[PDB]
Amino acid sequence: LDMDGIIVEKQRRLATLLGLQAPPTRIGLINDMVRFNVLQYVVPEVKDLYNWLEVEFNPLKLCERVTKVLNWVREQPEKEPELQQYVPQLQSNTILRLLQQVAQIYQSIEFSRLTSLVPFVDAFQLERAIVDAARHCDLQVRIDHTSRTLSFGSDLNYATREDAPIGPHLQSMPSEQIRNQLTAMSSVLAKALEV
Amino acid sequence: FIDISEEDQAAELRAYLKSKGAEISEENSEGGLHVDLAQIIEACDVCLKEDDKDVESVMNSVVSLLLILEPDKQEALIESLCEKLVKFREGERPSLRLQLLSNLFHGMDKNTPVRYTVYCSLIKVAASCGAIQYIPTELDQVRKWISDWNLTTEKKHTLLRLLYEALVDCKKSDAASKVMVELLGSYTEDNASQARVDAHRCIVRALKDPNAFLFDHLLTLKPVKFLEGELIHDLLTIFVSAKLASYVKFYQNNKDFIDSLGLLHEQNMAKMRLLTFMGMAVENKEISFDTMQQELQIGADDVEAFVIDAVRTKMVYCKIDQTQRKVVVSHSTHRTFGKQQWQQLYDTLNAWKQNLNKVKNSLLS
Amino acid sequence: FPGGRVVRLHPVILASIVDSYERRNEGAARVIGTLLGTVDKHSVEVTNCFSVPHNESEDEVAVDMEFAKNMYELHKKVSPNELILGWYATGHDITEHSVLIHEYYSREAPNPIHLTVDTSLQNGRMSIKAYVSTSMGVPGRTMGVMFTPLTVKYAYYDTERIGVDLIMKTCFSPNRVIGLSSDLQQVGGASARIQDALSTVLQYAEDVLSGKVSADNTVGRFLMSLVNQVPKIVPDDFETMLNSNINDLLMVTYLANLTQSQIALNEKLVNL
């Protein structure tokens, strides 16, 4: 409403205090730091799990991959009871990430079974967090279906809300779409390589 | 090491830079100037004897290599002299010497002994130090001039079927085996019983990996039309079975090597592959859930997941809905006559559209 | 590891070659300079260079290095690209002067990485050839350096390289950049001529006997790749989506030429 460019420019003033030169980006950080020995330096309690969070993807077998080892670290007393504040954001991320996964993987599954297909710690705030993924547009699904037949749609919207906003939170699944100059493109790609 | 940019005439020059070298050669080298001016005896002395205990002698081995093209029998002493490359068992300083005279420069490949001989040198030297960057060296020459010498092109058939096991990987296996298959397809090795080795391994390799999709890179240009079908080994087994789609049409055909490999995961996947591909192809790019269910004769949940396993492999690719548009355009598997008829009527669809649509834009251009 | 495999320069240095060699300021034959380039220590990413006036003859050796050090300060001060890599020289290739100016380069003492300029009307010999050398031991004569050839890669920012791609069409016969839209639809049609002339012959070759060999599932896969993303299958629902697109561009275009009117309309009743 009033001057959007303030705090996003102030993120530099925070970054310079941190010792950063530019403001923070995403998992690219952890992947130029698995350049170092971290994904082996981390304990085989949670060495193996990040290999499922990022690289080894499945819309069926990751709600029953992340959450087992969520509980495996929930071990409060001797496993530092400060690492337990990350469970409701791992929830939040798992929802909007694995929903992008399912939404690009297939284009129609009724939440009549998606509710149990994601057997986490939620039910009605689960629905409303799927609605939260829809409203702020990690993906696009037709939000408040009563019969609960929520199809995703094709294509209509690679405008503002495909990557959410620009960064890719999809591992190399996502299905295809068409737009404007896309003709020149692959047509004239696939053209000049065979010659 | 000591310099090469004295008067050249590199004879007494190489003797005096070798001054530092090991006892076994430097009890002979400078004294060799009285044997001859010494560019064969003195130029073979380093080829026989080994170094100090170190390969850092690569810097004076540059002299040793650059002193072969001019004075020596270069083809005989390029098979040799790159044999200290095996006799030390190091893979970085050798890797300098291998590229410095890889070929085409400061030696200048003939008539192609310097490709093969320095290639086998690289082979015995390093696992993957240079062996990553020695595909461009070979394919630089595949793109301009197929190896004139079939005797050295058969020695190339050896170094490419060597690469398969040299670096253990699915793509190194593919590249080395299939580019040997490519030049075999063009102009090499016929040679009836020596074609059987490529037929044998093209079974094992495209049976091992999905790097022919099923038979496709064994059906591309001429990799089964020379690699004969109803052969000693029967290449047509998987050819026909690539459209039969039944474990019984695998079981019935396979001999006691494919039995012991063994084909266990490949059947399930490749069945689900070519069935959905042909389902896509007919009924009709936007196929029925119930059709694919009662073609594969299994349930719902495996099928759902395996539709996206089918598009991740990308024999078919686009958006997929629940019970409609299961698998989609692009028939990325082999299409023999179906492509010939549709490619004819697509270049007809172009002659229609694009020649009409250019003067439509030239109307406003 | 071998430091010299592939030198990654782009047509900035190609423009640094010709201009420096087409004025010269009495640069008889041989122009030389210090090569500016970054190092990943496997692929040598290069950008700019800068040049000097020389009397390159026998046995007079001349590369103004201190001047090349001072304009290294200029080139880096203008763009934070690289640091000095070697000497880049005109024809001819490796001789005694090239190594006597490598002495002038070991005066500052980095790892040498070179680039020859071909003054010839050959087609077999590549226009530009980069060079490194090993051994490179040399506490001996002047510089007995063992030259390795370096194949070049033309890899930097791609809208430059498509800007290059129209400089290639200047190179054919300019070809001014005036009718962007109108003329990039002419070359879009020119692409479609390449398709039909290509697709027809690779069909009719296998109508005769044994065509579609290098065109079975190469162009066969890339016929599929044409139709992957133009056109879309035959979906008339998406044609309606577009026909509403035909409505909204008309609007974008109408708003466009009305704000053209709103220039003189509002802005020039100043003009009475």
3-state secondary structure chain B: CCCCCCCCCCHHHHHHHHHHCCHHHHCCCHHHHCCCCCCCHHHHHHHHCCCCCCCCCHHHHHHHHHCCCCCCCCCHHHHCCCCHHHHHCCCCHHHHHHHHCCCCCCCCCCCCCHHHHHHHHHHHHCCCCCCCCCCHHHHHHHCCCCCCCHHHHHHHHHHHHHHHHHCCCHHHHHHHHHHHHHHHHHHCCCCCCCCHHHHHHHHHHHHHCCCCCCCCCCCCCCCCCCCCCCCCCCCHHHHHHCCCCCCHHHHCCCCCCCCCCCCCHHHHHHHHHHHHHHHHHHCCCCCCHHHHHHHHCCCCHHHHHHHHHHHHHCCCCCCCCCCCCCCCCCCCCCCCHHHHHHHHHHHHHHHHHHHHHHHHHHCCC
CB atoms under 10 Å from CB of B33, counted, come to 14
Question: CA A162, CA C166: separation in Å to the nearest integer?
Answer: 32
Rounded to whole angstroms, the Cα distance separating B178 from B185 reads: 10
Name the DSSP letter for residue C263. I
Distance of CA B35 to the CA centre of its chain: 47
Question: Tokens in use for C137?
Answer: 């031991």
- In DSSP terms, A62 is beta-bridged to none
Sequence positions preceding breaks in chain B, C–N over 2.5 Å: none
Mutation choice for A interface testing from B292, B303, B317, B319 by most A CBs within 10 A: B319
Three-class SS of residue C151?
Answer: strand
Closest to C135 measured CA to CA, from B4, B226, B216, A123: B4
CA distance C167 to C147: 33
Q: Taking a C-beta distance cutoff of 8 angstroms, is the pair C26, C52 a contact? A: no
* CA-CA-CA-CA torsion sign (B160, B163, B168, B169): negative
Q: Between the CA of residue A9 and those of A16, A157, B35, B287, C103, what are the distances in Å? A: 12, 29, 81, 51, 50
**DSSP reduced 3-state for C34:** strand
User: Which one, of B45, B53, B1, lies nearest residue B24 by Cα?
Assistant: B45
CA A49 remoteness from chain centre: 16
Residue for token digits 């020039």?
C268
A-chain CB neighbours of B321 within 8 Å are 106-108, 151
**Cβ-proximal residues to C117 (8 Å cutoff; 6+ apart), any chain:** C17, C21, C31, C88, C89, C90, C91, C128
- Decide: C35 and C51 in contact? Cβ < 8 Å: no
For residue C4, the distance in angstroms to the closest alpha carbon of chain B comes to 10
CA distances from A57 to A111, A173, B265 (A): 20, 9, 20
Q: What chain C residue is nearest to A186 in terms of C-alpha separation?
A: C226
C180 → chain B, closest CA residue? B365
* Residue B63 CA: distances (Å) to CA of A114, B60, C137, C199: 72, 5, 12, 54
Which amino acid belongs to residue A5?
G
By the 10 Å C-beta count (0-12 exposed, 13-18 middle, 19+ buried), B259 is classed as: exposed
**What are the Cα distances from residue A3, in Å, to A10, A12, B247?**
12, 17, 67
Q: Which segments of chain C does DSSP mark as H helices, in order?
A: 11-22, 65-78, 97-106, 158-172, 180-208, 219-229, 236-262
Our CA-based measurement puts residue C230 at a distance from the nearest CA of chain B, in whole angstroms, of 12
- How do C114-117 and C128-134 pair as beta strands? antiparallel
Structure tokens at A146: 């009563």
**Amino acid at site A117:** L
Residue A121, token pair as written in the block: 């710690």
A191 interfacial to chain C (CB closer than 8 Å): yes
Chains that touch A (3 or more CB pairs under 8 A): B, C
What number of residues does chain A have?
Answer: 195
The reply to whether residue C183 touches residue B96, judged by beta carbons under 8 angstroms, is no
Rounded to whole angstroms, the Cα distance separating B286 from A33 reads: 44
Count Cβ atoms below 10 Å from residue B11 Cβ, excluding itself: 19
Q: What is the C-alpha separation between B305 and B311, in angstroms, rounded?
A: 10
Coil, helix or strand for A94?
Answer: helix
CA distance linking residue C200 with residue B347, whole number of Å? 6
How was this model experimentally determined? cryo-EM
Identity of the residue in B5, B92, B100 whose CB atom sits nearest the CB atom of C148: B100
Give the number of other Cβ atoms within 10 Å of residue A156's Cβ. Answer: 10
Q: Positive or negative CA dihedral for C235, C239, C241, C245?
A: positive
Gap between the Cα atoms of B275 and B51, Å rounded: 62
Q: Which of B196, B118, B211 is nearest to B164 (CA)?
A: B211
- How close C262 gets to chain B, by Cα (Å)? 26
Tokens for B272?
């689900």
Identify the CA nearest to B101 among candidates B62, B54, B130: B62
- The rounded distance, in Å, linking the Cα atoms of A192 and A153 is 33
Q: Return the structure tokens found at C264.
A: 């003189």
The nearest alpha carbon in chain C to B66 belongs to C146
Nearest residue, CB atoms, A108 vs list B312, B317, B322: B322
Q: Which amino acid is at B245?
A: A
Q: What chain A residue is nearest to B312 in terms of C-alpha separation?
A: A173
* Omega within 30 of 0 (cis) for the link into A163: no
CB C189 within 8 A of CB B358: yes
CA–CA gap between residue B254 and residue C147 (Å, rounded): 55
**Residues C194, A191: contact at Cβ < 8 Å?**
yes
Measured over the CA atoms of residue A194, residue C202, residue B277 and residue B180, the dihedral's sign is negative
| Tokens standing for residue A165 | 């906003």
Distance CA(B137)–CA(B142), nearest Å, equals 9
Sort out which chain B residues have CB atoms less than 8 A from C142's CB and list them: 5
**Residue in B with minimal Cα distance to C210:** B221
B172-175: Cβ within 8 A, 24+ apart: B173/B205, B173/B208, B173/B209, B173/B211, B174/B205, B174/B209, B174/B211, B175/B135
Contact assignment for A185 to C230 by CB distance below 8 Å: yes
- Which of A107, A155, A177 faces B320 most closely, judged by CB atoms? A107
User: Which among A60, A173, A175 has CB closest to B318?
Assistant: A175
Residue C177 structure tokens: 């950049």
Partner A, chain C 238-267, Cβ-Cβ below 8 Å: 238, 241
Residue of chain C whose alpha carbon sits nearest to that of B285: C233
Among residues B132, B306, B361, the alpha carbon closest in space to that of C189 is found at: B361
Place of tokens 């469970």: A87
Chain C CB within 8 Å of residue A159 CB: no
Query: What is each CA distance from C223 to A34, B149, B211, B338, in whole angstroms?
Result: 40, 37, 21, 13
What chain C residue is nearest to A182 in terms of C-alpha separation?
C229
Q: How far is B345 from chain A (nearest CA, A)?
A: 17
Partner residue facing C179 (CB), from B343, B346, B365: B365
Count of C-beta atoms within a 10 Å radius of residue C21? 16
Phi, psi angle pair for B286, to nearest 5°: -145, 55
The distance of B323 to chain A (nearest Cα, Å) reads: 8
Task: Report DSSP state, residue A174.
Answer: P
Does an H or E element contain A68, and which? Answer: helix A66-74
**How far apart are the C-alpha atoms of B217 and B224, rounded to whole Å?**
9
* Dist CA B26 CA B60 (whole Å): 13
Report CB contact under 8 Å: C189, B354. yes
Q: What is the largest CA-CA distance in chain C?
A: 87
Instruction: Return all residues near C67 (Cβ < 8 A) that are at least 6 apart.
Output: C52
Strand partners, C44: C7
User: Phi and psi of C111, rounded to 5°?
Assistant: -80, 120
CB B272 within 8 A of CB B326: no
- Residue numbers in C near A190 (CB within 8 A): 221-222, 225-226, 228
Classified as helix, coil or strand, C132 is strand
User: Residue B115: which of B156, B80, B84, B143 has the closest Cα?
Assistant: B156
Tell me the chain C residues in contact with residue B60 when contact means C-beta distances shorter than 8 Å: 135
CA distance B91 to B129: 6
Q: What is the DSSP letter of A80?
A: -
| Separation CA A64–CA A72 (nearest Å) | 13
Q: Using CA coordinates, name the residue in chain B closest to A101.
A: B308
Is there a contact between C95 and C61 (Cβ–Cβ < 8 Å)?
no
> Which residues, in sequence order, are CB contacts of A34 under 8 Å at separation 6+?
none
Cβ A190–C195 below 8 Å, yes or no? no
Contact at CB, A186 and C230, closer than 8 angstroms: yes
Backbone angles phi, psi at C151, to 5 degrees: -60, 145
Say whether residue C185 is in contact with chain A using an 8 A CB cutoff: no
Resolution in angstroms comes to 3.5
Shortest distance between the Cα of A113 and any Cα of chain B, in A, equals 12
Q: Left, alpha or beta for A164 (phi > 0: left; psi -120 to 50: alpha)?
A: left
Q: Which two tokens stand for residue B274?
A: 């070519």
Are the beta carbons of B202 and B214 closer than 8 angstroms? no
Only one residue has tokens 């009549």, namely A112
Integer CA distances (angstroms), C44 to A100, C47, C99, C131, C148, in order: 39, 10, 21, 11, 14
Q: What is d(CA B268, CA C63) in angstroms, rounded to the nearest whole number?
A: 69
| Chain B partners within 8 Å of A58 (Cβ) | 305
Contact C99 B17 (CB under 8 A): no
Q: Which residues of C touch A189 (CB under 8 A)?
A: 225
Written as one letter, the residue type at C26 is: E
**Residues in A touching B317 (Cβ below 8 Å):** 175-176
Concatenating the DSSP letter of every residue in A25-41 gives --THHHHSSTTTTHHHH
The three-class DSSP label of residue C36 is strand
Instruction: Say how far apart CA B360 and CA B35 lie, in whole Å.
Output: 84
